[PDB]
Amino acid sequence: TSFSDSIKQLAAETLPKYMQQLNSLDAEMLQKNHDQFATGSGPLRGSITQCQGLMQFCGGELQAEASAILNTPVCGIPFSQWGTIGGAASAYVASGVDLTQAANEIKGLAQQMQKLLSLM
Numbered sequence: 001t002s003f004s005d006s007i008k009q010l011a012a013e014t015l016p017k018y019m020q021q022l023n024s025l026d027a028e029m030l031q032k033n034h035d036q037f038a039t040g041s042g043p044l045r046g047s048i049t050q051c052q053g054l055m056q057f058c059g060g061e062l063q064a065e066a067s068a069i070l071n072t073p074v075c076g077i078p079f080s081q082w083g084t085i086g087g088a089a090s091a092y093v094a095s096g097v098d099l100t101q102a103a104n105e106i107k108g109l110a111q112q113m114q115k116l117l118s119l120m
Contacts, residue, residue, distance in 0.1 A: 003057070004057065004058065007053050007054065007057050007058065008054070008058065008062075008120055010050075010053075011050045011051075011053065011054055011116065011120070012117060012120055014046060014047075014050055015047060015050050015113050015116065015117060016117070017043075018043035018044075018046050018047035018050070018110065018113075019043075019047070019110045019111070019113050019114070021043035022043045022044070022047065022106055022107060022109075022110035023107060023110055023111070025103045025106055025107055025110075026100075026103050027098060027099040027100040027102075027103050028099075029103065030093065030099040030102055030103045030106075031093055031099055034085070034089070034090070034093050035085055037083075038082065038083050038084055038085050038089070038090075039085065043110075044082050044083045044106070045083040045084075047083075047110065047113065048070065048079065048080055048082070048083035049083065051066040051069050051070050051080075051113070051116070052066070052070065052080070054066035054116060055067050055070060060119075061119055062116060062119040062120065065112075065115050065116055065119060066116060068112075069109055069112055069113065069116075072105075072109055072112075074089075074102055074105040074106055074109070075092065075097075075101060075102045075105065076092075077089055077092060079105075079106070079109050082106065
């Protein structure tokens with residue numbers, strides 16, 4: 001082992017699972033499982049947690065891509081905030097807005113995480 005590889009290695013074993021999960025997402029799921037999702041090892045929190053690690057500890061395009069992903073807004077709120085409860089994301093879901101586009105954009109981003117796999 002290397003620290004560097006351990007990080008990478010663990011994102012590779014965890015990101016596919018979050019991705020498949022997020023990829024089921026819809027407006028209603030979002031409204032429902034947000035706390036769950038933004039909690040412990042839920043796909044939002046887990047995946048954001050995984051991208052942050054690659055941001056913090058790797059270099060080059062893998063770092064640049066983790067970054068682009070975390071900073072992409074999802075209806076105006078950076079994806080990195082979607083893994084948190086009691087903030088902007090929670091307020092937004094707590095507004096009654098249709099969450100179709102929000103779920104769609106998280107979907108997209110989970111698909112973009114494949115680039116991270118691929119860079120790995």
